[PDB]
Curated annotation (Swiss-Prot):
GO terms for biological process: prostaglandin biosynthetic process. One of its GO terms (molecular function) is nucleotide binding. The record marks 85 as: Lowers pKa of active site Tyr. It comes from the Eukaryota. Its EC number is 1.1.1.-. This is 9,11-endoperoxide prostaglandin H2 reductase. It catalyses: prostaglandin F2alpha + NADP(+) = prostaglandin H2 + NADPH + H(+). Belongs to the aldo/keto reductase family. Catalyzes the NADP-dependent formation of prostaglandin F2-alpha from prostaglandin H2. Also has aldo/ketoreductase activity towards the synthetic substrates 9,10-phenanthrenequinone and p-nitrobenzaldehyde. Keywords: Cytoplasm, Fatty acid biosynthesis, Fatty acid metabolism, Lipid biosynthesis, Lipid metabolism, NADP, Nucleotide-binding, Oxidoreductase, Prostaglandin biosynthesis, Prostaglandin metabolism.
């Protein structure tokens, strides 16, 4: 039904963007999922489990697999939110319009829900943003935003834009809690999506943290479920990645418990401002 396009009767919550679009608060990330079957299966399994939001990017090389999983699921496309991103090499007005068309074609879609500037770089994000504004005017995209932007990048963009970014997708997990950027984005009504919400694997050690383990035990949930619920209760969109059917299902089962104020505080206090992923200041491979 059309109401499913607006995520009205469903188990998951949404965050509302400044243009009144409702964005599902939990999605499936697909970075490092191989194109073809691995991605298609992950996406299909996520949709079967109840997910209605997939996060991909041109540079993940698996937009084909994402669209294949959506089609294989049989769920009407209007009920699913798809995010993708313009890569560094495609920044600049005309290159961004072209990159969008390529992504839309690979995905097999008539429109994309959210299109993001993937990394700021230094010199082309303003012109890139103008292309996103054009795509939005043309109704090719339902929402437009950025990723890995710091307050200084956003302030610079604000001086030139007609439509302010609706989303900023940034690294955010219990060791790197982005307090300053979150304050800035709250002030200016820019929704935050957390990438590497689980720390991007075992190296970072988040899922073995003792505090998370104790909270998990109290709720008979897993540490991953606790982290995802912490994201939810902070009003953050979260896009945990798994290619494993069981873990995909586990990460969705977060709507039937609540963390207390004290549990939320305990997780907040894990912050070390320890960045696990790439730094917006110097990560811009592939610029042209
Ligand atoms: N905008 C950007 O610049 C940017 C950058 C990085 C990431 N992202 C997006 O954010 C998404 C999420 O971040 P991420 O992929 O870096 O990592 P993540 O979601 O923080 O962690 C994924 C890792 O955790 C494992 N895992 C997932 N669920 C689990 C569970 N319940 N129990 C135990 N282990 C679990 C996964 O293994 P299995 O797959 O084997 O389950 C994988 O090794 C990406 O996929 C991508 O969509 C965006």
């Amino acid at each position: 039904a059309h109401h499913h396009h607006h995520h009205m009767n469903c188990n998951y919550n949404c965050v509302t963007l400044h243009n009144s679009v409702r964005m599902p608060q939990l999605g499936l990330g697909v970075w490092r999922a191989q194109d073809g079957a691995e991605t298609a299966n992950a996406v299909r399994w996520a949709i079967e489990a109840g997910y209605r939001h997939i996060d991909t990017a041109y540079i993940y090389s698996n937009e084909r697999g994402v669209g294949q999983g959506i089609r294989e699921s049989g769920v009407p496309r209007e009920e699913v939110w798809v995010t993708t991103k313009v890569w560094n090499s495609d920044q600049g007005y005309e290159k961004t319009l072209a990159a969008f068309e390529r992504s839309r074609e690979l995905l097999g879609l008539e429109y994309i829900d959210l299109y993001l500037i993937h990394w700021p770089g230094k010199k082309k994000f303003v012109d890139t943003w103008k292309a996103l504004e054009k795509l939005y005017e043309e109704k090719k995209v339902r929402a437009i935003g950025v990723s890995n932007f710091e307050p200084h990048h956003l302030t610079e963009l604000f001086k030139s834009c007609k439509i302010r970014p609706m989303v900023n997708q940034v690294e955010l997990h219990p060791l790197f809690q982005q307090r300053t950027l979150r304050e800035f984005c709250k002030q200016h009504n820019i929704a935050i999506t957390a990438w590497s919400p689980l720390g991007s694997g075992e190296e970072a050690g988040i899922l073995k943290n003792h505090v998370l383990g104790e909270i998990a035990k109290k709720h008979n949930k897993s540490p991953a479920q606790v982290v995802i619920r912490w994201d939810i209760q902070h009003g953050i969109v979260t896009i945990p990645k798994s290619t494993n059917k069981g873990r995909i299902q586990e990460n969705f089962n977060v709507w039937d418990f609540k963390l207390t104020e004290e549990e939320m505080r305990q997780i907040d206090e894990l912050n070390e401002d320890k960045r696990i992923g790439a730094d917006p200041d110097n990560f811009f491979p592939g610029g042209e």
